[model samples]
Target: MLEQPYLDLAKKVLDEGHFKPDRTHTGTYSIFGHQMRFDLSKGFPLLTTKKVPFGLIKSELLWFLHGDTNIRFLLQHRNHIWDEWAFEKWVKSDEYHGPDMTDFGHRSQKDPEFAAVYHEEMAKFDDRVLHDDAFAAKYGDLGLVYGSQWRAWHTSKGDTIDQLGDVIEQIKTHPYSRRLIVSAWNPEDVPTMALPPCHTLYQFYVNDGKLSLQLYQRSADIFLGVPFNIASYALLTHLVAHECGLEVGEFIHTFGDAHLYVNHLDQIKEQLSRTPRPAPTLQLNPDKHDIFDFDMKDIKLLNYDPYPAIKAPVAV
Candidate 1:
């Protein structure tokens, strides 16, 4: 029942969360703080209550690990999760000659005609990013995303710090060191960011020859975002442990403002009624010692039998 915590979280939020407005203007059932722990040794925590897109999760995590900020990498892998953000940027730019996409995220959901146009525009945007190198370099880059913050952190003097690499080195050399941490929350850059890091900061701990990670997420979309996050971090912990030559331990997810978007209330309720299936086992290529070198083919999931996916509108 490694995935039960996720279902439990959904029910808790539905039952007791306070109703509040969010940045996207979509109201949410908000809760202040929460935590979930997944024992990695038991199974990979990809939820079985609903069919989570493991491929999207894989590519997104790989993109972050590669420290790539452009959508070209994602587009090549057919992962469209971040396409909207990049599309928004392109439509707002001086070079863009498309139709008015102002408030496209919220507008498209309400209007079918607008939704069709938005879809066409987004398709064009993805194509351009994939084919045109210059266009991708200019508009595809999502500045200061998780990849930028996690791997290449900017310093005041213009020198870049490899936070992830440094942390891994510390884990290997100084296994018992309490200072193993990688942070993505930069106060200086938050104001300019389109979407700040939700799973903001993460720290690693080594004990009894096993590796564990604790993540502090500042905001969470319980219905849509949390499932991907749980699997993402669990996979991360497994990969990091593999690299460090340690056994997998646990993924401790700590939240700050965990909430379900008010619009997604029915979706969350429907998910809670389903019984969770068995969690899957993760298989990593033994030949790939370095986590950075792992491609899509290097990772595999076995025995993942889950219920049908529950679709819901994302609060953009």
Candidate 2:
């Protein structure tokens, strides 16, 4: 039944979605307001549909929890998920004096000579971020991103609110308050932002001593980003469950617009063909209970036998 959640959603979108125009010029077949639920008690819902890199998910979550906008932390962990976003900022800034990265799209750039030049420049940027403090201070920082939103979000009154800390406190003290929400939406921000939290907000609900999570994504890349989001948020749920001394309950991912890019049709069908294995187990270090103090070694995934990864063109 759990295996069906992801596939069924994929099936529904493929079978019933409408052809729609989106902000991205790449077209998609879209369906609005589709949601899927997973019971965390069974196991972690990392997609057996494709090999979801649990390491990337772990490092990114830790990086965000550390309240860092600088790509330095991510680079330190060798997680390049957000590298392209910061690279654009570097190229756009006066700091850059390199080849015309803009001439080639981030997608097409991957398979050309431009890709070599682009990746060379990107590597330099990464080195500077990891070593040079001043350069990293100026360029590495992606402003008002999820890390900032979760840890040090600014308020209208100009005081930074520790949203995660506040929510953790709420979950600890008032588990059944129905107000355990952590929002990344600040009218003062978003829009002009590059990573404006498409998985905009999340809420934690406790029932009978089990913790559950729900997310509302503004728009989803059905084939690729959706799987990562599913795994990442579920991992966060496990971390939170351990921190709160509670059992993992459920996670529900609800999207405002769920769309499969026309380009990824074959990839989707391939995933649909593959049978999912049992869910993976996410284990945390019993010695290190503090989520903030934990590192890569402290978290481990056991028995994640997934299908070979499906590759598709990614959008910036």
Candidate 3:
């Protein structure tokens, strides 16, 4: 449970930092994001102030692990979280069209129409070339490129298999080896991806029967994405530790270009002002130790006290 150390550091950094706008960088704000590390040996990780529902976090992680490319699955399970992004992006897209318009007239249902076209296009591309490297290079846009590389890494020789399993096996068979690393940031393959990796590469360390993980993220959206990012990687650490026949020890998050968009300043301020409650406990199915096999139903959270949900605009 991370309460004092993590929350204190985050607040201090945000409150004391000076803002100098950087037009070249994302969000165009000079405020840099802060990084927080936690030792899992203490307990399950959960933010104290923000009541991040365990169900939503579990479902989102499961969706990512399942290698789902489209937003449909996430929307179905947690529509309220993603609907605005979907709708906003749909309207902003080039495909948007409407019927005859008048002053305060009811416009055509262009939103749904755009959505249908987007889904259809994604589906057609997914079906036509999910496995073909050439096709994936050309039209693979549904699945984030990192998810596939981490779960099912395709080697230069064109072999497809679960890299997580191989990583576990390496940790178990050769605990002293420095090769216990699973990287999602493939520089050679970044151009083919729809978006560059954010929660990029992660390395595993084993010492005295305890396993630890360190992640390097190139960018972070402090308000909207950081909490989810923390939970996802921490859960991954637990899963990977279990698979390697070891207990989770620590999770160190390193950042390169973390920032909160100007639009999310109020949301960040609100979260920081609130009193932090006790960290929640996460429970996983005892029967499932395999990383790939765990689903939404296998995870649960207990005891969360947070302020009411506050809305923030995404700076995509």
Candidate 4:
């Protein structure tokens, strides 16, 4: 039953959502606002309707926690979720001599030949990020991304604020303060950011020795990104709870624009047909008290039996 809200969201959006155009030019079936909650006490909220990749989630989360903005960390962990963002920068640079990758995101989806070339170029980019330290430092860094915004927010006073670290201290020292929040959106950085933070901000609440988190996401690609958003925030709640000596409570995901790409309609329908299974349990290394120090081996998902992954085109 943990994933029912997710499936229901998809069905509802498909049935009654307004038809609207997106910046991607891939039209969407959208609603203005929606919310979903997962009780971490029950089980982890990795979706059962379709197989969701947990490894990528773990690596990406750890990367953020470490304040790493470079794609090198992700590539080293074999996580390519952010490669395209960094690659776009690399391709646009004067140093890039590769094939014309301009508009690669949209073109790849329409032209099979371009898709192949895009993948080849992406693979090359990944290799450079992994092996060439100088290149990685120069081209692989996604400045002012979630990691930077969360852990090292630049201020006008010429200093950085460790928002997440401060929030952790707040959860411990001032658990009842009603101000345990970390935000990722910075209006100043929006103009140059590859993609502005979708999950714009999150707040933590403490009650009866338990921790709960609520995230306000500005926009959500319902079919592709929301599932990952759910699991990522759920895991974050668990990790923060683990460190602060509190039991896990719930993860509330609030969205501003939640929509399914028109191209994802059939895939969303297919997902609705699958039966829900028992949600997986998360196991954390008891010795890893510091969330920032967590590695891939420190987190594990147990008993996750989901249907085969559904394929859908990512509307870039």
Who is ahead in TM-score, 1 or 3? 1
TM-score against native, each model: 0.98, 0.96, 0.74, 0.98
Tell me how far the alpha carbon of residue 159 in candidate 2 is from the true structure, in angstroms, after superposition: 1.7
Q: Candidate 1's residue-wise lDDT over 1-316, tens digit each?
A: 8888888888898889999887787898989889999899899999898999899999999999999999999989999988878888898899999889897978887877988899898889899888999999999998778888989999999989899999999998999989999999999988988777888899999999999999999998899888999999999999999898999999999999999998898888888889878789999989887998789988999999999998888785
- Comparing 2 with 3 on lDDT, the higher-scoring candidate is 2
lDDT of 4 by residue, 1-316 (tens): 9999898888889889999987988899899888888899999999988999999999999999999999999888888898888898899889999899897888887887888889998888889888898999999998878899999999999999999999999999999978898999888888877678888999999999999999999998889999999999999999999999999999999989999999899898888888999999999999879989889999999999999999998886
Error of 2 at 63 (Å): 0.8
Predicted model with the maximum lDDT: 4
**Which 10-residue window in model 2 sums to the lowest lDDT?**
103-112
> What tens-digit string does per-residue lDDT give for candidate 3 at 66-109?
65554555545743343333333333445535421221111112
Give candidate 1's whole-model lDDT.
Answer: 0.90
* lDDT, model 1, position 170: 90
Arranged by lDDT with the best first, the candidates are 4, 1, 2, 3
Model 2 residue-pair collision total: 0
lDDT of 3 at 110: 31
lDDT of each: 0.90, 0.85, 0.64, 0.91
